Symmetry: D2
Subunit: 115 residues, 4 copies
């Protein structure tokens, strides 16, 4: 597992559970091709998206479906989704965690890249 | 006035100056049409992107070119850009400020929405 | 002018209005002496806390009364307050903006420091 | 372990390792009494601060020594420390994670409170 997504809820102080997450890889023609997807677990985490063999250098987009998450909690949100776009680089550490902290009108995101 | 972008640098403790920003609007065919663009000033603010007439209802994407910002400063950052995607003006005209706070491996973004 | 506090609400997408703020300065005996206080306006800003003369070098604590804010809105938040502690004016006078973005279980804070 | 502290580095995209963390409990006379302390691990985490028996309701302060952290990396920071002040409440979930994401002139903090 070289890619992991962690989502937190700043309103309830909890993991953000059952959030849909879609990962795309940028194609040669600049379009976004589907790469991996899933829903966050009870811990707010989504493991098992890809493998080392599949996760080659390139530009990836992680789309977190925040709007559906907030609406399922009965809350009106601002964003359609949260988007995290980055280059995977073999020169740096091998494990990427993309973390996001969600509020209705705001989000924060960070990358934790380790070996 | 109807749309304003403010960025800030969390490393320097300063406005993020000269940050390029591209705004897109989702067209009827579901592509992202270029809507407006500009650069942040010495105050980290970008005014004058659009007008009340042209800023109709729709789904908008504000792309803040964070990589270009950090690379112009000689720093190798993580993200390509920060993208802020939202429906606007669906209950009539509002004024939107999209703010972002940048670090090399992280960013925060918020919206301030006001009704004139 | 030398010290300004801006808060924002990440739930509402608005300025955080009527937020109480207490500033302290570390005294020679290492206690926190009251320095100034005030409330954010309808814009989420708090101006007029101090003067260039009185805002001397020192270690300052800006306490933003987030619990009182959320409880006045009928919400039970996690934190008591947000505390921002920093050395100021140690290389001569600067202008400081302390900003905070509030959620019930979280907050972000940043500083914008400028040299007049 | 009912209390855990996690610290991340937004400049390097990493755990914040070897950060000193002090926890205080508010006494009856409104002073802060030392409660627990330690240094974050290689994963940016500090476990083992307290036990269920010791961690009674009350107001706690977690002080994260961000200034020393940044200076040890050769970076000039703004804050003296980051401070997280909260009430432990038995009515809510039993496990508290206090997370902080550090930059030189900024920090973010959240609480993840679960059962
Ligand atoms: O709508 C406005 C207008 C002028 C200033 C600001 C602003 N100042 N600081 C922020 C700010 C602060 C933190 Cl701590 C954040 O995490 C984010 Cl996203 C924005 O936004 C926001
Ligand atoms: O409880 C955990 C366990 C593992 C990782 C995290 C975590 N990772 N990132 C954060 C995080 C991210 C952002 Cl954008 C934030 O503003 C904050 Cl305060 C924490 O928290 C939090």
């Amino acid at each position: 597992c070289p890619l992991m997504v962690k989502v937190l809820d700043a309103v309830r102080g909890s993991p953000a559970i059952n959030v849909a997450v879609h990962v795309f890889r940028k194609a040669a023609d600049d379009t976004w091709e589907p790469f991996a997807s899933g829903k966050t677990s009870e811990s707010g985490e989504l493991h098992g998206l890809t493998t080392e063999e599949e996760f080659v250098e390139g530009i990836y987009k992680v789309e977190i479906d925040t709007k559906s998450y907030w609406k399922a909690l009965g809350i009106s949100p601002f964003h359609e989704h949260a988007e995290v776009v980055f280059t995977a680089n073999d020169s740096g550490p091998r494990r990427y965690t993309i973390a996001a902290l969600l509020s209705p009108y705001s989000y924060s995101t960070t990358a934790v890249v380790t070996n």
